[PDB]
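Researcher: Batch entry, complex prediction.
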Amino acid sequence: IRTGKQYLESLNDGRNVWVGNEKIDNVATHPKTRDYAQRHADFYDLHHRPDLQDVMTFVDKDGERRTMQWFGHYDKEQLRRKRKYHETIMREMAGASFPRTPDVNNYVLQTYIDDPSPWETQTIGAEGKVKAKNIVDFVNFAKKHDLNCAPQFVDPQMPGLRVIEKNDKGIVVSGVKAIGTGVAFADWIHIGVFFRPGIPGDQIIFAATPVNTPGVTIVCRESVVKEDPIEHPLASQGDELDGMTVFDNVFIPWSHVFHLGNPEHAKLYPQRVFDWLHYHALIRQSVRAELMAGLAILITEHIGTNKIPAVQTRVAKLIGFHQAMLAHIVASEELGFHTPGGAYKPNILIYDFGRALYLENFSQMIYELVDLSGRSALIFASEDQWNDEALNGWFERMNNGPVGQPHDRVKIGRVIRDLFLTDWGNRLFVFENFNGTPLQAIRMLTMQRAEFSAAGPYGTLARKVCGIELT
Amino acid sequence: IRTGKQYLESLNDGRNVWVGNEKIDNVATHPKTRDYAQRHADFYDLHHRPDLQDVMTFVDKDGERRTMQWFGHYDKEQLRRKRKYHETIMREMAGASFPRTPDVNNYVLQTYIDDPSPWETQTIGAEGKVKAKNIVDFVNFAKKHDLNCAPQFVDPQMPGLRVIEKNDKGIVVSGVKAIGTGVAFADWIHIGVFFRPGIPGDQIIFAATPVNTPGVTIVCRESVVKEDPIEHPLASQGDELDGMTVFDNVFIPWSHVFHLGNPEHAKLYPQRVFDWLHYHALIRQSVRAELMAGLAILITEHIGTNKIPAVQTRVAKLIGFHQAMLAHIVASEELGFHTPGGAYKPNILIYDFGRALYLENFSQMIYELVDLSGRSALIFASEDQWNDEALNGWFERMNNGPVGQPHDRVKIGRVIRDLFLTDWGNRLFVFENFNGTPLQAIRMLTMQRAEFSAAGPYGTLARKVCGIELT
Amino acid sequence: IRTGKQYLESLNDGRNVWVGNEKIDNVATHPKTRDYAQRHADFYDLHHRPDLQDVMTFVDKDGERRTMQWFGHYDKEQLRRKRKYHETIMREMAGASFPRTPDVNNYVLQTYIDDPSPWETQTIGAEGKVKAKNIVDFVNFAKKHDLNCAPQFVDPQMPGLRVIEKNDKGIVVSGVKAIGTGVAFADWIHIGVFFRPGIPGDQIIFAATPVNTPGVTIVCRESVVKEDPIEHPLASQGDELDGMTVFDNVFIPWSHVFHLGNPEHAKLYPQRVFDWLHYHALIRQSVRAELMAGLAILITEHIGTNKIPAVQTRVAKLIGFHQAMLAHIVASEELGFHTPGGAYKPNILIYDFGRALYLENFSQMIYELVDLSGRSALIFASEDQWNDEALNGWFERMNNGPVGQPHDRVKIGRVIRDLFLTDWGNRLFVFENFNGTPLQAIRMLTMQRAEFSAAGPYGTLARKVCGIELT
Amino acid sequence: IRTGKQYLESLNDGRNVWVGNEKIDNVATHPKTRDYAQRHADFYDLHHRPDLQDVMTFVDKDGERRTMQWFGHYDKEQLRRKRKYHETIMREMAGASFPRTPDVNNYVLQTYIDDPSPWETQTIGAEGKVKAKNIVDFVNFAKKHDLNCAPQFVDPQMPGLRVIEKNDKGIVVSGVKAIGTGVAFADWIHIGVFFRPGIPGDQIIFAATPVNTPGVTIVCRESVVKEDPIEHPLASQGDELDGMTVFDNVFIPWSHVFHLGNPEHAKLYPQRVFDWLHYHALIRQSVRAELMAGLAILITEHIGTNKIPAVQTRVAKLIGFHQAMLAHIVASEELGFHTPGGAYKPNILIYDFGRALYLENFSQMIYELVDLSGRSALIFASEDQWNDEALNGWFERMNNGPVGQPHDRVKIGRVIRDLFLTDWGNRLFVFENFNGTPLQAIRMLTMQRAEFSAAGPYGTLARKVCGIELT
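Model: Structure tokens for the complex:
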């Protein structure tokens, strides 16, 4: 039900935001932030598109219509409904150029809904002031208004956020949340933490607070959004800003506290929370792969190198790369399971491996596409050069191919340039490794699963072939 | 339901065979052949295993019980049942060490009985002498008797097989089939050919003839069976020979010819025949990967290196390789289609990309496992050394670890040796590139599919992101 | 003797230049071009540095002092003197960020000097108006004034530059030179061409003409130089612009013509010309590698991950990468030869292979460094954020390491960002493949050398081991 | 100058030896040992080759003529002369197929005679019982008689060798040396050890004892010599056995102990001892690569695939692999240094990086060659098949190409088979990772060098580009 207009309205709420060397008066209108804010506007609007109601919305138990980003899936086909929703969104929005739209941010909160209690029961030293029902109500609240709750669970390296005081009203926290994406554009900050060896319980904190909370400062890297939307058809659409959040004696009422103290809790449940983001990331990676492969096809075709055998095998490897993501998504969904609350989850082991595959090869694949695109990477016309009466004829002669109009090669060059050769595109590059646990982490925790031990069920085939042990 | 004993008897039919410098009087008993012969006999016997009845057999339309190698699948469920059959055989037989067991050779016959008429329809030099019913009758015959029909299509690179004469009794062919596997162990030779630029119609032959047919000579590489089965538990189980088949005026009755003359037919139909072998190669490939990963886990666990991060990382890498194959299989079965005769076939594009992913990496994955095993690969006790009173105490002290008995290290090493460090193991290495179209072919072939053209459906996302219209 | 001042002066000469959508009135002062122009100014100035006279200059035969960019080397130690010169330059100028300083552009002209005649004698249909002595004088002239002769030999894909008219005064040419680097900043355009299958002799053209020649238009991509030199300590120093050059009925007097017509000539001699640029490129690649490895060291040290074993091996691979370039440079020089004019040339086969090595791996190496640098890639402070009284303390706490001051991590982040995550840095990325023949081309012409044939001297060892042929 | 005949006689000294399950009465004559024994005898004989006198021998200070294995090099020229020796031996002997010929085993002795005193100086449990002169005297002795002294340092992974007793006649040691190569073929065992965390001083032993010493047992892997030398021209030349050596109260006179007790000495001195083996491993590695590239050229030429671009590319890839090794060798010799005793040593960092580059790629390079050979790898005529009247004409038609005789294909295939597809070939595969510190060790070790520290000289370029001072 929420509109881009309401959302844009809400932006101007006093929130304290740096973007580079500058303070931002109003995120909705400031030149450094307005485009990305409009993309979030577009997100809400897209749910009101009449031809999209089938995909974008569903009808809650209470009879109310809600956006699909709050939709629980209890079987495989519902799971696939959820993915069709996420895909549709990222397909409309610059081919997955914006990995943290609110559907991704809020997906994660399905874990609380599914099983609120342990967050309450496992909470150490809050004298039963943490109340599972609070979490549940908060999410319902977020569902009701379509609030965008940016998650922040990543802490500094070896200043972390900590409770400095507790009382009958709530808590006061102080410190920094080291990594956050698009928080300046959100409604709530969703506080979390991951277990680390020797972490203190006053740093074990799960909670929510509005972006404009007194004492909160959002501190973001400089925006790298482009001015000219013809030269930069993608990079001009907004910069999904990354930064940290700073907490100066910030008060959180008990009703927005989710769990405190128990480091035991903080090792499995936070992962349970993030599994949904990990799964989205794979979905996204698949789309980015399909995009890359398509660009390969278009460019090699327009230049006319596509039937050169050495080029063909190169374009196939890009298509294969896409297919490898797709296959892990589909397999994971095929071999999923049910969580405590009965929600259907895709196979964690499989989709994370799908991510490992992406994170291990995406760099080289980008290289292949760029390389295939040759001089059309750096050197091509600006629009005024192309339309100049004296230059235009030389230009059409130099970009004449077997398909489309010559100027099409420039359309393709602009997309490749923005996606892979600009600050804007390169942020997304770097971010791939922060959009969920990174490659080496994925492989490590894999090796923790008991199932991969010597006597474990996985290496059953190996022991038989070697004639070892048994029973 | 044929038995091993019956099979072994069937071998003494006077077929003439070279294994290296030696003619073979009886493949069933010759010291260079008898083990692998026994492996095939074991294959028939597995179907009489009371505890494998459910996996190994099916009851057909007529209440007739038959081996699952003859099972047709019109369902994802059914296909899946066939996979489990193939997998089961492979896990019982030296872990996928025997790539051309009859269940595989006969798999391709499905294509014929699915859609036999165009085979007859399209023949040139016909005279209605080529009859579809003969093709069906033959397979049905092969079915009743559990006949092993080894496929031989691949030709000498740029002397193939050709029709010298054709009367109304049958045809006469001379020439050679360059590559065949275990033909010396089959019952019948399945003749065929692939289209190539400028192929004479007198070389478009699909037929079948017994292995001992007059004018036929099977010419095999030397055998690399190992004598000592303690030292060589796998390599001593027998050598699946490769070689050529020579046809010297070989006569074939019209009852046994399936197509002649039309090289257009040779384009896509022989490929349909082999889609099944390719899919099986993927099944087998994942089993191989599962074994490899298993071994890595056993050896690092037994040595005690398994918890070194940089080691963990590598074992997870191998587990990922397996999950990747499994993902393509499962995904391809999810998104399969129906052939003209109604059989359900997994997505060719996907399962073929799964093979490419394997052919592209197995060499490096194999090296990963070998490196991981250190000296335990190379130097290890022979059995008599182990048991020697003076040596034994030294060997035991040197092979002690956190897991199992010190001698289990020798057991593990022996398997890794046979698999990857012997003539025996290495023929499987080189053979992978011949169990279907090689990696380059897969890649060339996908870029011929029309959907990957600039205006194809595949590039729609990219055309849209670029603001480009086709058409 | 020439100064940056004189050079900057010369810039304002009427030359016709587009940079993006804009016409440039004066390359020396325009905001889009002034920084890179000042870098060329700095180049000339650096030769007047008293402490550098040993390296930057030498004394000609005529007793005159000249810059080392005109210095012929006749033995190994003189060769190494030349490299010490090129290195010194690229070491002073933003760690090899500017691959086409004039020393590189002009190096190539040593091939004419060394052997002028064939250019004259092989010229077809110029009625002996092409005169080797002209080439020689031109170069002397360029040596005398330290002119910067930007080379342009690359033609459009499949508009090329052609002679449209010849006469007693000279020639008129029309067409486009497709790729050119920093031509807007040069003094002369050095025209050339490489042989291609089925190239017409009216397109075989070697010559020189001033940048501001009537009829010449330089058409460059948009400048991506940064405004803020604190946030962007490298990208703010200027953009080495790439573009094409357009010739509208441009007249070249015979005295600046070098060769015409003979396509035979155009297959070996142009390569002979470019060998010097190829060699420089390897020298440059080595420096860029040493830079990357150093950054790896600095960043892993400041964060404190350097002694983590998995990180150590990663930093070593970067150092190894540097060493691989260095080793090819040193070997090539060790095993060099003499050209017709007696100049000492490093081993072509070896240094090109050094380039192949770089071009094949540089993408992954950059990836390794970026990845190693973690969040310091995207998220770090702008200077005003860092110095803010309220933020400064949180910031120093989050960037506290075992070495240097916390703010040092930001210095390192700025360099990594500019070098690998900006339009500016990414141009250099793409350009690596245009700075000499690309990877696949290197490998192809390798396979043309007669020495690599079957009977050739290279595979002598293989024939002996196989017992094949001989004498 | 020792002869082969003398060597073979020397073998029948009653040394006790296991090769697999068998004790060996006379290594010189035993069917499992005699070929490799003959290879060593051939090695001595090469030095009497009249036409190899110049490469194989040198005249020393005293006008004494000696084998180049005993040559000390104080010059780049001299080092280079020694390289040519090593290379020559390798090219005469199955192309580097025998990694542990005596010239290699004895190479490490140079370190002793270069700088013997600290070996004595540093001993603990001394009593001046350990004398440097004995070390020098021994090597000089080994020199006069051309003694093969096999080095054994590597220990059992976490039972090594230990001193039980020490009187004033000598010492008594028990334990086992885990890895040795061709010890059963040597004259003397060269005892040594590497430092490791927490190593008892009674395990710091450097000494030498005859192979047939009482209490010594050489325990070797089964031998994989091939019988038929037509079919197996390389693998039939003999198996360089690997295994362990057991010491059961072995007595060693003080004349023959080189150091005891001090594990600090064990740090960098044993490494100095092996610097020479490592450098030789590089020499050998390039020869191996040269052979591989040679074979690729022969097989693609003979098959006629050699001019397919995508094939050209791959062969150039293999030629590049060879040039890369050659470059590190040549470069490392250019930038070598002088040891304490004055010997000239090539740059360790460089030549060790050359080994890493090899260990990192040889597996994939090997696969490249094997793939390139197609079926010609696997299936090919045995000799008797080739010569058979009926078969012969078929075989010849099938092996015809643009180059050589059709049978040369078989010759090529046989070598590629032995080299990479047999137990014999594969032990060389696995052994590469043991001919010196493995790839991980090389990498770990360079990051210990102080020059790679943040403030080290190496990172100066980067510190300067970042505007950072050290510290």
